[PDB]
Amino acid sequence: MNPITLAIIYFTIFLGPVITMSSTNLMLMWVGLEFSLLAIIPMLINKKNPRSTEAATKYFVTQATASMIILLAIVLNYKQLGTWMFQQQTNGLILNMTLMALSMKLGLAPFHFWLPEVTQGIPLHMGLILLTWQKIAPLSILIQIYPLLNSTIILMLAITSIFMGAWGGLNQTQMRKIMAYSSIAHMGWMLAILPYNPSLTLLNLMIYIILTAPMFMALMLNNSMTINSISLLWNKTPAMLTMISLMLLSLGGLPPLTGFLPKWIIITELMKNNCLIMATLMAMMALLNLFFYTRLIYSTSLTMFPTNNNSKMMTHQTKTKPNLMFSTLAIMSTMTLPLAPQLI
Amino acid sequence: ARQWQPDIEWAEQFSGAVMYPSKETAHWKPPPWNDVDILKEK
Amino acid sequence: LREHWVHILVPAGFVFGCYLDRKDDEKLTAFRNKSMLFQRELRPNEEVTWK
Amino acid sequence: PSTFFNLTMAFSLSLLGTLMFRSHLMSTLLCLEGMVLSLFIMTSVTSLNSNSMSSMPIPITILVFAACEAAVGLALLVKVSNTYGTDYVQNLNLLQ
Amino acid sequence: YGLLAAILGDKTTKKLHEYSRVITVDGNICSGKNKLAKEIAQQLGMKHYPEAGIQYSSTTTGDGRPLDIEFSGSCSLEKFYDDPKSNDGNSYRLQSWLYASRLLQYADALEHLLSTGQGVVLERSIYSDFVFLEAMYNQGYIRKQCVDHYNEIKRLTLPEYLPPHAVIYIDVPVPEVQSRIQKKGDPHEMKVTSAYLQDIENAYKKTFLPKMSEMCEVLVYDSWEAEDPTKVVEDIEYLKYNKGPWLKQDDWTFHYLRMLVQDKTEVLNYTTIPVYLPEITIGAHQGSRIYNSFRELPGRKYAPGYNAEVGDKWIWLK
Amino acid sequence: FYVREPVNAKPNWLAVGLSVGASVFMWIYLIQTHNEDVLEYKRRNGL
Amino acid sequence: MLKIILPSLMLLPLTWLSSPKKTWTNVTSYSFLISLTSLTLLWQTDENYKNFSNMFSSDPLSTPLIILTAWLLPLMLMASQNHLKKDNNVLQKLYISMLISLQILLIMTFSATELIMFYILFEATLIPTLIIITRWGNQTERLNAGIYFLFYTLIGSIPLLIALILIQNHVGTLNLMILSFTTHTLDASWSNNLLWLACMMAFLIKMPLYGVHLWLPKAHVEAPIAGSMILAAILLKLGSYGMIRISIILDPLTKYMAYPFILLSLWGMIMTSSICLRQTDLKSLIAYSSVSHMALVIASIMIQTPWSFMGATMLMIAHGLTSSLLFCLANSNYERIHSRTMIMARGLQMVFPLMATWWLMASLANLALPPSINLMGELFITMSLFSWSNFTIILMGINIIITGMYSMYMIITTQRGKLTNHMINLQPSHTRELTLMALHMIPLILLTTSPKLITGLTM
Amino acid sequence: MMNGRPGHEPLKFLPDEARSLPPPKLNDPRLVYMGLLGYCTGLMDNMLRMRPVMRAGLHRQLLFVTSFVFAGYFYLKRQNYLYAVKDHDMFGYIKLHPEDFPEKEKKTYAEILEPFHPVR
Amino acid sequence: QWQEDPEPEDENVYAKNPDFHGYDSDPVVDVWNMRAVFFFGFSIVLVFGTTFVAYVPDYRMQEWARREAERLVKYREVNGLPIMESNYFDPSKIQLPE
Ligand SMILES: Nc1ncnc2c1ncn2[C@@H]1O[C@H](COP(=O)(O)OP(=O)(O)O)[C@@H](O)[C@H]1O
């Protein structure tokens, strides 16, 4: 990429979420969403492999129709209130549209089909951006409008996502898609507490970002899109085997690690609000997510899969190092739990 | 003797585009490692 | 110490343990002499019933 | 008034369209646009009968962003009938 | 080397000159290509890379002293010959390590070409490795899947690297090579069934040569033209480097290729793909031991610059 | 030693001085902030 | 209680920093002394529970265990010096640290005032244990065993998480002290009848009940000796400690909500005891012995009579020490024999004279010989169970007869009969093997002299 | 939640009102934890990059232990404020709307008949 | 078949180091890993520990209660009061319902 183009695109992919967050005029929030859609598509097809064009053409159609639905909500509001922004008075259907639409861009629940497929055809790098710096934008729009959205729908999309994400993940063996599925699940918890305590959504996101960003830079350190590929981690780079183990169990909710806090406080907030029906079912299938996380643990760490002689060759050569971010984001993530009170 | 490290066969299962292969799903084949399909002369 | 410093690591833990332990006592010092069962007037030359 | 319900249903009829592909990517990219026209018409209509001139900028910003959006959409389309010789969606089933 | 450097100068465009090309010379097991190579190199100052070896990677990395056989993948060309169609498959393991070695050599060559600007003569290349496997499968040496595994590695890694500019070639009929073998006597090299040598050349003649003819400049030389480096060198300086994929390599395109070869761990990333054919598999218990032992060699237990055994210093501030 | 000599043959004297020097600026600002802070807190409230 | 804990943490730095050759002695020698500091908690001249500080407390029920948890780390590290002496010097220092963290975590869990501190630390102990079982497990099936050990505990655990957050909203603090001195009386609704099950089920799972105990036979089979000692001696008892402190609340329901478990346990005691009678794997038989002798405990922590509780406290500490002793000697036979089969290796006393004395005393502890805390324990649970219903003696009476039979069968077909002709010749006994045993039984003899210390909260 | 409060500083980290609160003692266990959390990050880095774990980057080790800690004092300083605002806000309401939070008076046990469920 | 190692035999550590104590292969570490384990194990835990545990005084007050009973039984019997009256919390303190 002519480095100039790289700058323009990257600026847009970054001006995209930032305009959304900063503005209050919904319109300006919509174009922030629009710029993110335009900026991400070029990077998605960088290899320009036949799989890639498929990825982008899906991502784009799914993103575009949702963008149009979000605009329709703003256009309708403009007639029901002269304001260009959702208010207490807003017709309920107007808000529900925004939930569905925004739940498509974020890819939650019954609209979770595009994400796993686009996460499969894009590079590991652009995978991260597509999973974590593109969720900030839509979530911002929701978090702003939380007082007004429906508790019922969110919960249904929340629970569905948790289930779909979990069930989908169990079968998958491609890593990119295992992560895509996890993201659907975590995204679910996040949207469950939005109606009740938005501030916790912003924790269940950061922690997801501080967990997923190290996890993916791990997958690419050896650029392994297969579990079999990550399983030979012990030969290619032995040290990351320890933290890859804890980060994945952290992604699932197991108690000593940082990953428990988001689930724990979301459950505490939902019980405070009396959803002890919903919270219980979510926590239970949340346990399904750890099963596929630990199955990967087995292959990568607890058991040593057989490797190839040609690997000895890759050992010889100095391994290009993992950026510092890996460490700082691996530790702050695997073990901050002793510092939970301040985090919340 | 020595803790059983996984043999080739234990490894085999984790290959294939889906762990728990379905009736028609199994018919599929793992994605190309290069991420570029052999496709066709077109 | 010819690489025997390692030894102190654990012992030292005990000392800091007992120190931190005292700290808690210092913190939980209310009721020093207000415990009904043990409420007594300080005997001569004693400013603390239990330290 | 009713004028608005026709435009809104136009957008839903265009909605039903984009969500039900018929083997032609181009046609879809063309339906998608049918919405933008319906949104542009509705935004312009209410702005005009609310005499809200401060908002007319929007009816056009909507079109400017929608045009590029479509530009990107068509370049993907051209990219597809360069890799598969057709815009037919069925071809787009490699990511299964 | 990175975008930062490239952004500020450091362009392969500014470092290329007529003598700067990737020239490989390929022949049969004994085509005298070793000699022609050195000379062509001496002619244009081209860095002459030696044919890839079992321990070429070890000479490449760290100390450069030859590694123990098991550390270098336990491959014997010697055993290749004395025990063809071996139960353990040393011949396929030999071939797979050889492909990895030339992948490292070709990538090191491209890194020298784009950085220095000097050209490179690489003798046999990843592009001319398949002839040994084709002959081996034509013989009982390798089975069909073994072939597929090599082809898969070749399809995954070879396309990324740019093609040889020209591919100087020698030819000396099988009788010639067998006789040439007798002159340098080595029990192992000596016992190479002719038909196998027949299959090696046949592939170049039929597959490799025309293949590259369309892609790169093809200069085939009869033994007599050979042993006359001057004449061959002359002809290279004569051919016009036009036809080929190299024409589109703009500076902003070279940068990415450079950053690849600059990273050896990636060059052969797909060489270790988890396809479990039995010959290739290390095996966890044996592989773990070989690793604990290769990683404990002096200067290898830590990254270059940080292992004190070989005399590295300043580790406490690095 | 190393045929391909290690890129990190010796420390990046700059990387030491901005790593060491940066940390010593952190403390001198941090410790300053605390005592300064304590004061304001003490005086802001009665003492 | 930060001397039983901080000095413990510092063990981790010592296992890592210390020389590869001297790593074993620094760690084992120091934790022996760590146990000596643990003995200070036993100084309770008065009734008042010793609330060290806000989060850390030790009452009669926890104190007898914290000392056992600290005591076994030395022993665990002495029983695993053989296997795990074939490792790379960084696999060892990981195993040693894993064992160290278990008692750090277990010491805190047994010494925790806030019930959810129990939960977080409670369910954390699975991480160290699963690594010990899966990473170093000899058999092909430990991946499976690990899954069983993680899911059975985890599915039970999330209900307890919901329940404890639930009581915090209902009462306003999960502090065991307050919860005790506050009025929390459930109201026998249909919902409460569920709360009770939510709180007890997670504890009932790791305390193998007849219905959910399949995890323990599978886990101890492939687990390394140190993991099997930890699971039997401290890990299973985590479930019992939890049931004692959690049933302070949910006071009214267990009067009638316990019948299901009580009957599950007493019938379970008979069947688990009986299948020990014909099980070919010795480690298998000890594990089911552990299920049955722990089925007695869930049937005393539910009858809830003063005697039951301290019968339970007596038996849990006693059976913990005895089981390990049995699992430790089983390993010594396994390492020389190289097979878990009970039928092979017959006649050992002929070739290992003393280990057989340790085998005999361990079996007599296993069955109820009378001048042992093991018998006092069962005698007491038996008494209360009889009080609950005189008929209980029949079922707690078939178990005693069966328990005698399998305990002696382990001695009769492993340590008597004609010697096996020529298995790989059995090298003589190391002094470590014998001490690891002596260290288990000498405390069993000393505790039996003064049973008062391990009697529980009730008495 | 706490946003929308009167006087809210729209983008400020810790409003000066937080001056009134005591400063976090530099050795507060938490800041000390952050320190250890940091040292470990450093050590971990060395490990992943294959350097002598403890004897390398002794400059970095310092940057880490000193970056994390620096961050702590100024974060905790805030989180401490946020919690303190919460009381100011909470306690105030209890009063301004007194009737809703009425000080009840329990009866002594002598009067309260608590049910006795006999264990028997 | 894949490459993997041939089964490693287990050494008769008692063949060399005929004084093997079971802790480590080289002899001096062996001796110094039992001279410190029997000592810290038996010599100052089973001995000093049992000494200290034996001398814990009146554990859980059961040495105090066998006297307090004796004075109470001394006082109650001589003054004619019932040795264990039948209600503990005095009836007067209780405020029964109506
Ligand atoms: N794929 C391969 N399989 C087996 N041997 C190979 C392969 N590629 C190269 N060689 C070895 O390379 C050697 C080249 O012969 P040599 O006389 O050393 O150099 P030159 O080929 O220049 O004459 C041959 O002896 C042959 O064994």
Cβ–Cβ of G120/A260 closer than 8 Å? Answer: yes
Q: Which residues make beta-bridge pairs with G114? A: G175
Cβ–Cβ of H117/G304 closer than 8 Å? Answer: no
CA I28 to chain centre: 33
**DSSP string across H65-86:** HHHHHHHHHHHHHHHHHHHHHH
CA–CA separation, A135 and A118 (whole Å): 14
Residue G276 makes CB contacts below 8 A (sequence gap 6+) with G285, G288, G289, G292, G402, G406
E strands, G45-150, are none
User: Least CB-CB distance to G7: which of C6, C14, C24?
Assistant: C14
Local structure of G60: helix, strand or coil: coil
Opening angle at CA G49, ends G47 and G52, nearest 5: 140
What Å distances lie between residue H83 and C42, C43, G151, CA to CA?
Answer: 39, 43, 38
CA G302 to chain centre: 19
Nearest to H42 by CA among H67, H16, H60: H60
Tokens representing A53? 């064009």
Count of CB contacts below 8 A, B vs G?
9
Query: Positive or negative, the Cα torsion across C25, C30, C34, C35?
Result: negative
Cβ–Cβ of I3/E285 closer than 8 Å? Answer: no
Q: Do E168 and E221 form a contact (C-beta atoms < 8 A)?
A: yes
Count the alpha carbons within 13 Å of E112 in the hemisphere toward its beta carbon. Answer: 19
Q: Domain tally for chain D?
A: 1
Local structure of A308: helix, strand or coil: strand
Q: Do A178 and A226 form a contact (C-beta atoms < 8 A)?
A: no
Identify residues of B whose CB sits under 8 angstroms from chain A CBs: 5-8, 10-11, 14-20, 30-31, 33-37, 39
Judge if the beta carbon of residue E114 lies within 6 A of ligand 1: no
Tokens representing B15? 């290959």
Judge if the beta carbon of residue E125 lies within 6 A of ligand 1: no
Tokens representing B8? 């080739």
Residue D15 makes CB contacts below 8 A (sequence gap 6+) with A65, A69, D35
How many other CB atoms are there within 10 angstroms of residue D8's CB atom?
17
Measure D2 CA to nearest chain A CA, in Å: 13
Judge whether E296 is closer than 8 Å to chain H, CB to CB: no
User: Least CB-CB distance to E270: which of B8, B15, B33?
Assistant: B33
Tokens representing B36? 């570029």
Crossing angle of helices E194-203 and E174-183, in 10° steps, is 120
Q: Which residues of G396-424 are buried (b: 16+ CB within 10 A; e: fewer)?
A: bebbeebbbebbbbbbebbbbeeebeeee
Cβ–Cβ of B4/G338 closer than 8 Å? Answer: no
Judge whether G457 is closer than 8 Å to chain I, CB to CB: no
Judge if the beta carbon of residue E130 lies within 6 A of ligand 1: no
Residue of F nearest to E307 (CA): F1
For tokens 């010989």, name the residue: G369
Q: Which atom of ligand 1 is nearest to the CA of E184?
A: 17
Residue D88: CATH number of its domain: 1.10.287.3510
Nearest to C22 by CA among A340, A218, A133, G3: G3
Q: Which atom of ligand 1 is nearest to the CA of E80?
A: 4
**Experimental approach:** cryo-EM
Opening angle at CA G216, ends G211 and G220, nearest 5: 165
Crossing angle of helices G306-337 and G431-449, in 10° steps, is 170
| Chains F and E share 3 or more Cβ pairs within 8 Å | yes
Local structure of G58: helix, strand or coil: strand
What Å distances lie between residue E225 and E31, E37, E218, E232, F5, CA to CA?
Answer: 12, 14, 15, 7, 40
Cβ–Cβ of F26/H20 closer than 8 Å? Answer: no
Q: Do G271 and G210 form a contact (C-beta atoms < 8 A)?
A: yes
Q: Do E126 and E158 form a contact (C-beta atoms < 8 A)?
A: yes
Mutation target among D72, D78, D84, D91 for the A interface, most CBs of A within 10 A: D72
How far, in Å, from the CA of E270 to the mean position of ligand 1? Answer: 24
**DSSP string across chain E:** --HHHHHSS--GGGG--TT--EE--B-STT-SHHHHHHHHHHHHT-EEPPPP-TTHHHHHSTT-PPPPTTTTTS--HHHHHHSTT-SS-HHHHHHHHHHHHHHHHHHHHHHHHHHT---EE-SS-GGGTHHHHHHHHHTTSS-HHHHHHHHHHHHHHGGGSPPPSB--EEE--HHHHHHHHHHS--HHHH---HHHHHHHHHHIIIIIHHHHHHHSB--EEETTTTT-HHHHHHHHHHS---SSGGGG--HHHHHHHHHHHT-HHHHTGGGG-----TTTB--HHHHHHHHHHHTTSTTTSS-TT--GGGT---TTT-
Q: Chains with 3 or more CB pairs closer than 8 angstroms to F? A: E, H
CA–CA separation, A239 and A242 (whole Å): 6
How far, in Å, from the CA of G287 to the mean position of ligand 1? Answer: 62
Residue to probe by mutation, ligand 1, list E28, E29, E193, most atoms within 8 Å of CB? E29
Which stretches within H4-57 are classed as H helix?
29-48
Tokens representing G412? 């009769």
For tokens 């500091």, name the residue: G37
Question: Contacts of residue G136 in chain A, CB cutoff 8 Å?
Answer: none
Judge if the beta carbon of residue E34 lies within 6 A of ligand 1: yes
How far, in Å, from the CA of E29 to the mean position of ligand 1? Answer: 5
Question: Strands E47-48 and E169-171: what pairing?
Answer: unpaired
| Chains F and I share 3 or more Cβ pairs within 8 Å | no
Count of CB contacts below 8 A, A vs E?
110
How far, in Å, from the CA of A193 to the mean position of ligand 1? Answer: 68
User: Least CB-CB distance to I5: which of E88, E281, E285?
Assistant: E285
Local structure of A140: helix, strand or coil: helix
Q: Do G368 and G379 form a contact (C-beta atoms < 8 A)?
A: yes
Judge whether F34 is closer than 8 Å to chain E, CB to CB: no
Resolution to one decimal, Å? 3.2
Q: Which residues of I30-39 are buried (b: 16+ CB within 10 A; e: fewer)?
A: bebbbebbee
| Chains C and I share 3 or more Cβ pairs within 8 Å | no
DSSP state of G131: H
**DSSP string across C1-51:** --S-THHHHHHHHHHHHHHHHHHHHHHS-TTTTT-GGG--PPPTT-S-S--
Tokens representing E313? 């210093």
Q: Domain tally for chain A?
A: 1
Tokens representing E316? 């406490």
CA–CA separation, D11 and A69 (whole Å): 9
Judge whether G18 is closer than 8 Å to chain C, CB to CB: yes
Residue A112 makes CB contacts below 8 A (sequence gap 6+) with A161, A164, A165, A168, A184
User: Least CB-CB distance to E291: which of A235, A308, A320?
Assistant: A235
B32: left (phi over 0), alpha (psi -120 to 50) or beta: beta
Provide the residue type at G330 as one letter.
Answer: A
Cβ–Cβ of H119/G255 closer than 8 Å? Answer: yes
Judge if the beta carbon of residue E98 lies within 6 A of ligand 1: yes
Question: Contacts of residue B34 in chain A, CB cutoff 8 Å?
Answer: 49
What Å distances lie between residue D16 and A114, A327, D11, D30, D76, CA to CA?
Answer: 18, 48, 9, 13, 22
Nearest to B34 by CA among A171, A226, E258: A226
For tokens 């988001």, name the residue: A262
Q: Do A29 and D64 form a contact (C-beta atoms < 8 A)?
A: no
CA–CA separation, E100 and E88 (whole Å): 20
CA–CA separation, G144 and A302 (whole Å): 12
The beta-carbon contacts of E246-249 under 8 Å, at least 24 apart in sequence, are E246/E162, E246/E163, E246/E165, E249/E12, E249/E162
Burial class of residue I96 (count of CB atoms within 10 Å of its CB; 0-12, 13-18, 19+): exposed
Q: Do G368 and G282 form a contact (C-beta atoms < 8 A)?
A: no
Count the alpha carbons within 13 Å of H27 in the hemisphere toward its beta carbon. Answer: 1
Residue of A nearest to E90 (CA): A309
Q: Domain tally for chain C?
A: 1
For tokens 């996460």, name the residue: A119
**DSSP string across G97-119:** HHHHHHHHHHHHHHT-SBHHHHH
Tokens representing E180? 């040439």
Q: Chains with 3 or more CB pairs closer than 8 angstroms to D? A: A, B
Judge if the beta carbon of residue E235 lies within 6 A of ligand 1: no
What residue numbers bound the domain in which A234 lies? 2-344
Residue of I nearest to B8 (CA): I2
Tokens representing E88? 């353990």
User: Least CB-CB distance to E61: which of F4, F8, F16?
Assistant: F4
Tokens representing D70? 């479509």
Burial class of residue A133 (count of CB atoms within 10 Å of its CB; 0-12, 13-18, 19+): middle
Judge if the beta carbon of residue E157 lies within 6 A of ligand 1: no
User: Least CB-CB distance to B19: which of A51, A173, A225?
Assistant: A173
Judge if the beta carbon of residue E49 lies within 6 A of ligand 1: no
Q: Do G323 and G290 form a contact (C-beta atoms < 8 A)?
A: yes
CA F35 to chain centre: 18
Tokens representing G430? 């190391």
How far, in Å, from the CA of F3 to the mean position of ligand 1? Answer: 25
Judge whether A342 is closer than 8 Å to chain H, CB to CB: yes
How far, in Å, from the CA of A312 to the mean position of ligand 1? Answer: 22
Which stretches within A2-105 are classed as H helix?
3-22, 26-44, 50-80, 92-105
Judge if the beta carbon of residue E29 lies within 6 A of ligand 1: yes
Local structure of F9: helix, strand or coil: coil
